Amino acid sequence: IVGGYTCGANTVPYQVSLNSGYHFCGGSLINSQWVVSAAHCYKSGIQVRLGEDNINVVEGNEQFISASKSIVHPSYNSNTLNNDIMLIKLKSAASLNSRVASISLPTSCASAGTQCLISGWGNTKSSGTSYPDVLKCLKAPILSDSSCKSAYPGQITSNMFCAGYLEGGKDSCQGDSGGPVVCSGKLQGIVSWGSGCAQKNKPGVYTKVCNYVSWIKQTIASN
Ligand SMILES: *C(=O)c1ccc(NC(=N)N)cc1
Ligand SMILES: [Ca+2]
């Protein structure tokens, strides 16, 4: 997160850390056994870490559950990042509590101007490298499709939306990818890509979650 604030331990209970010997992407707990993340976070050997604040210290409240399968969306395209969505099945169910909870899927897409919360343990530096220990947060509005497109001509599909600030100085960045964009309580976006981090006129681009509700439900119901 570039330009965000420390969230406060356990205040974003659906936030997960994808780990393979170090934190590499986030995700969101959408139920006791399934996490949604980005298809580009895919790798084998993933341990899902729930209930984390400081990712370098065991402080209590943590649940380390391995991934039992990851399902990249079948039309995910790595050159464009269209369909940049993946579902992870946990090997056992998580203990949901006040520090580990799931986030609702949307029933409709969010409109421009909606304010959302992006969270992640990604880089905090726009020009440079600085990973945080604790979770960072950033409030950011969904931008109009007009503006999203005029910033990334020819690269925005109908499965993406831009959110953030055109001025620069506030955006998601490397290591935030996979994590959530929550709006009025629902999961509307997945941290997917952008040009640089926090650069003016180059907002963050997000997987459009509402277009995937039926796929998720169907996929989960048969796995
Ligand atoms: C994911 O790690 C990721 C997503 C988005 C960006 N760029 C911007 N938000 N500008 C970087 C890395
Ligand atoms: Ca920890």
Curated annotation (Swiss-Prot):
- Listed as disulfide-bonded, the cysteine pairs are 7-137, 25-41, 109-210, 116-183, 148-162, 173-197
Q: What is the E.C. number?
A: 3.4.21.4
Regulation of activity is described as:
Is inhibited by scorpion cyclotide trypsin inhibitor TopI1.
- Tell me which cofactor or cofactors this protein depends on: Ca(2+)
One GO MF annotation is: serpin family protein binding
Q: Where does Ca(2+) bind?
A: 52, 54, 57, 62
PTM (free text): Subsequent cleavage after Lys-125 leads to alpha-trypsin. Further cleavage after Lys-170 yields pseudotrypsin. A cleavage may also occur after Arg-99. Not sulfated on tyrosine residue(s).
Where is the catalytic site?
Answer: 40 (charge relay system), 84 (charge relay system), 177 (charge relay system)
Entry similarity comment:
Belongs to the peptidase S1 family.
- Protein's name in the database: Serine protease 1
Q: Which source organism does the UniProt entry give?
A: Bos taurus
